[PDB]
A = this chain, B = another copy of it.
Amino acid sequence: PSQVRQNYHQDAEAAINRQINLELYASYVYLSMSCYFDRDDVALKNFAKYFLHQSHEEREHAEKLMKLQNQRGGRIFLQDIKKPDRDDWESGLNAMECALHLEKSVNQSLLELHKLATDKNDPHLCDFIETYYLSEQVKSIKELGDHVTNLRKMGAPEAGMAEYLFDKHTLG
């Protein structure tokens, strides 16, 4: 064992490595969305900016878990980052719905990690998760739900002005 390791179960170490991969995957999905909105036949610059910001945030989430793994004396093992499920995200509304689904799946993973940390009596890891991840995920999910609600009410994607005006007012 590492000279720093204390109260850090092998199952937690493995679960953190899984979470690192999931956050890197989420970053890649957001990047894919961002570059869809930069296409000349889509051309919604503030949707593109919004998803690029989310991509960079997910990267920061992954890097903070890497720092945690080393702080606790675990060892980082990286895996392939799978490509996103689609190249064409269809519409601003569809991308926001897909983002909401993704954020909820990441939250579910974090709740399973917290349950594991609780079961292994690892309060530092429980607190880490609560302080830096759970907080943030609830806020993200609520923001995406609000965006989906507004776009649907405005008539997106069939009402042509809806995504245009949402891009200007809400995301601009």
Give me the interface of A with B, judged by CB distance under 8 Å.
Answer: 2-4, 6-7, 28, 31-32, 35, 38-43, 45, 52, 59, 63, 66-67, 69-73, 75-84, 87, 100, 104, 107-108, 111, 114-115, 118, 121, 123-124, 126-127, 129-131, 134-135, 138-139, 141-142, 145-150, 153-155, 159-165, 168-169
Asked, given contacts A78-B28, A161-B154, whether A134 binds B124 with beta carbons under 8 Å apart, the answer is yes
Q: Can you list 25 A-B pairs, Cβ within 8 angstroms, ordered by A? A: A2-B145, A3-B149, A4-B40, A6-B107, A7-B107, A32-B78, A38-B66, A43-B145, A43-B146, A71-B138, A76-B87, A80-B82, A80-B83, A111-B123, A114-B123, A115-B121, A123-B130, A127-B134, A154-B161, A155-B161, A159-B161, A161-B162, A165-B165, A165-B169, A168-B169
* B40 x A111 contact (CB < 8 A): no
Residue of B nearest to A39 (CB): B70
B73 to A40, Cβ gap below 8 A? yes
A49 to B135, CA, bound (A): 23
- Chain B residues lying within 8 Å of A52, measured Cβ to Cβ, are 63
Chain B residues near A165 (CB-CB < 8 A): 161, 164-165, 169
The reply to whether A35 and B142 form a contact with Cβ atoms under 8 Å apart is: no
Q: Is the CB of B35 within 8 A of A76?
A: yes
Q: Is the CB of B141 within 8 A of A4?
A: yes
CB distance from A133 to the nearest CB of B (A): 10
Shortest C-beta distance, A13 to chain B (Å), equals 13
Given contacts A6-B107, A43-B149, A164-B169, 6 further A-B contacts (CB under 8 A): A41-B145, A41-B149, A43-B150, A70-B142, A155-B161, A168-B169
A69 nearest CB neighbor, chain B only: B35
